[PDB]
């Protein structure tokens, strides 16, 4: 086949460019941000995804910088990166070589939705548990994804391993520094962001994870809507009208407005009868108006809903064993070390 | 209250400006296009919606021109229109005074979706029937809405009358003249448009009406997806991979590509068991790959699914009588006069 060679720089390395060859090139994605290709490394023969975006060269790329700093089992790994050309002359293009992952949580959920089936609770636990773990890690670096949603959760069919991807909106949130309110994706945008808050924290990702969980249990997005107001009405229909204090926690500029008082809708009636009580409990501790009242990602991992995954005799529906879910490092537990008593079961510590 | 007076020009009139006063002003909508206010006419005391958009004055407004030409019982009426100012100095703003309508098909469908209920078949018929009638009318003028979706279908709670609104994307399609492919709304975009066709016809609105119908029967959008490709995959999962001929009908530039052959999914399995056979039949005649094979709006009105509405003893769940659904004019039947034999029942002709 047509072999392409370039001098790429390793992702997690001392910045030492090297020759890299690849073939079997084919477009597998295209957006306003750029085109995404699939390729096979001539060396290892492994499949990779090449995300090509337009770079000004005069400004550093935030995504690249964030990625080159990440190294976790639940985060898409950045193999190499390099510059080139392609669309419209006299312009530099940044190419991100990431590991290729077959499916996404979104596509799997879709299969079940049109199959009139509910995703087995076992998978909901496996996926949510890994999502929170990736969140505990990026947050430990003070990094906020700002775009958590099913489409950005890559999955390995066989291993059932989940990897967070798409860091094109990620940013390091410095306590005491403004930030754009119109961030994240529609259905998954925290209430504070819909109210135009500018001093939000990483807790907006936990809200997004809660919407994800709820969607997996419901079979469809829990808070649909075209505009922010629509979104907020969907949220209020479930959580009820927020109190003045909750409103103050989200955006004090709305404290004195007198919103109609709508009664909250019981989480039990929201989901189906056969919904695990622990799932509902976990959901209510994630989808909280007050951002500081939401569970931390590390705390969510310790929640009872994930007890089954801590069972020594747990197995995947396909017979295989569950991915490594207890290899927590010091950096991962930094936020709350004591939790290691629960996060790491006895049959793993020794 | 604070009374505002202006010299507005009547919508369906000989262009004779007059004084108009109104109060009870309050924002009820805001978008990238402009702000929408609600007001009460000092004269009749009737409620109206004022859509204020930015106008260059150097270019005629397509929406205004299209609206001033429309006059139907199933189309939002344009009361008056005038110019003024508001946001950012030295700029002219066009204000559209339209009749105010309380709800939308989207909001009603939403109520049922979170109530775990299915919208009563009677309403599905009433709404779909009126939607097609508004389509038969605008199409008779060679006008294509290009943005049919639940949110643009206004409803009167009591009368159950439906009015099509939002003509900000409407355009007169001249046979043999290019047009933007990225038109309509996501979930409701015809296949030809997703394939980037530029010579599409008004039949794209009929596809959108079919997605609307399917959503009302399903309880959720039938073809979800973030991008076009995602949309197309959802469509293919239901209708099956399109044949070369169907592909040629949509966009000949894709004739020779060899797409994997996926088996169609039976419409019976798509909806729930208790779904009226006539609804499913109507749906399959609307959601057709070949745009020329789709039923015309006037033909859809004659479909058997709407027989119940032609029953002399038909009534609304609230006891009231059904809106005027047989007052078809010559202009409305122009497309296919003979159909008047079915469209207008015996207990109405005389």
């Amino acid at each position: 086949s047509k072999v392409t060679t370039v001098v790429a720089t390793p992702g997690q390395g001392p910045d030492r460019p090297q020759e890299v060859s690849y073939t079997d090139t084919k477009v597998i994605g295209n957006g306003s941000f750029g085109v995404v290709y699939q390729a096979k490394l001539c060396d290892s023969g492994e499949l990779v995804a090449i995300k090509k975006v337009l770079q000004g060269k005069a400004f550093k790329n935030r995504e690249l910088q964030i990625m080159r700093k990440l190294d976790h089992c639940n985060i898409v790994r950045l193999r190499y990166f390099f510059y080139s050309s392609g669309e419209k002359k006299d312009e530099v293009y940044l190419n991100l070589v990431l590991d290729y992952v077959p499916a996404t949580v979104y596509r799997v959920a879709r299969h079940y939705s049109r199959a009139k089936q509910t995703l087995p609770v076992i998978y909901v636990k496996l996926y949510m548990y890994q999502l929170f773990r990736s969140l505990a890690y990026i947050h430990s670096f003070g990094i906020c994804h700002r775009d958590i949603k099913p489409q950005n959760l890559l999955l390995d069919p066989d291993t059932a391993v989940l990897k967070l991807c798409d860091f094109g909106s990620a940013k390091q949130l410095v306590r005491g520094e403004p930030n754009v309110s119109y961030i994240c994706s529609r259905y998954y945008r925290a209430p504070e962001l819909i109210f135009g808050a500018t001093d939000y924290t990483s807790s907006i990702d936990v809200w997004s994870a809660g919407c994800v969980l709820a969607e997996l249990l419901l079979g469809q997005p829990i808070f649909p809507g075209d505009s922010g107001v629509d979104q907020l009405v969907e949220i209020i229909k479930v959580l009820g009208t927020p109190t003045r204090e909750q409103i103050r926690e989200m955006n004090p500029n709305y404290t004195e407005f007198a919103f109609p008082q709508i009664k909250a809708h019981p989480w039990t009636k929201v989901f189906r009868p056969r919904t695990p009580p622990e799932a509902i409990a976990l959901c209510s501790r994630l989808l909280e108006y007050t951002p500081t009242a939401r569970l931390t990602p590390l705390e969510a991992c310790a929640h009872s809903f994930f007890d089954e995954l801590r069972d020594p005799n747990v197995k995947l529906p396909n017979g295989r064993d569950t991915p490594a879910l207890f290899n927590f490092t010091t950096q991962e537990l930094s936020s709350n070390p004591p939790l290691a008593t629960i996060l790491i079961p006895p049959h793993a510590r020794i | 209250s604070k009374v505002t007076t202006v010299v507005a020009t009547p919508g369906q009139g000989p262009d004779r400006p007059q004084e108009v006063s109104y109060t009870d002003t309050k924002v009820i909508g805001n978008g990238s296009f402009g702000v929408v206010y609600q007001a009460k006419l000092c004269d009749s005391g009737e409620l109206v919606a004022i859509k204020k958009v930015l106008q260059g004055k150097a270019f005629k407004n397509r929406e205004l021109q299209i609206m001033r030409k429309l006059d139907h019982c199933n189309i939002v009426r344009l009361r008056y229109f005038f110019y003024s100012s508001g946001e950012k100095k030295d700029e002219v703003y066009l204000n559209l005074v339209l009749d105010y309508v309380p709800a939308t098909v989207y909001r009603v469908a939403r109520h049922y979706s979170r109530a775990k209920q299915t919208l009563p078949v009677i309403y599905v018929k009433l709404y779909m029937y009126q939607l097609f009638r508004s389509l038969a009318y605008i199409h008779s003028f060679g006008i294509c809405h290009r943005d049919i979706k639940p949110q643009n279908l206004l409803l009167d709670p009591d009368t159950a009358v439906l009015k099509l609104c939002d003509f900000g994307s409407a355009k007169q399609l001249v046979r043999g003249e290019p047009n933007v492919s990225y038109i309509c709304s996501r979930y409701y975009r015809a296949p030809e448009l997703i394939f980037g066709a530029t010579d599409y016809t008004s039949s794209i609105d009929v596809w959108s009406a079919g997605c609307v119908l399917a959503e009302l029967l399903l309880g959720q959008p039938i073809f979800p997806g973030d991008s076009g490709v995602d949309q197309l995959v959802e469509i293919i999962k239901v209708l099956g991979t399109p044949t070369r001929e169907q592909i040629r009908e949509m966009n000949p530039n894709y004739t020779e590509f060899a797409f994997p052959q996926i088996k169609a999914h039976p419409w019976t399995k798509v909806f729930r068991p208790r779904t009226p056979p006539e609804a499913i039949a109507l749906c399959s005649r609307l959601l057709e790959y070949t745009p020329t094979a789709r039923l015309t709006p006037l033909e859809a009105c004659a479909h058997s699914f709407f027989d119940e509405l032609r029953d002399p003893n038909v009534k609304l769940p609230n006891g009231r009588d059904t809106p005027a659904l047989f007052n078809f004019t010559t202009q409305e039947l122009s497309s296919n006069p003979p159909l008047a034999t079915i469209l207008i029942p015996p207990h109405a002709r005389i």
Partner: peptide, 18 residues
């Protein structure tokens, strides 16, 4: 002006639902 207008819209919508 932003809060005031956003609030008005939200209030209008909530009054309809409730």
């Amino acid at each position: 002006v932003e809060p005031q207008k956003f609030a008005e819209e939200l209030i209008h919508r909530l009054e309809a639902v409730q």
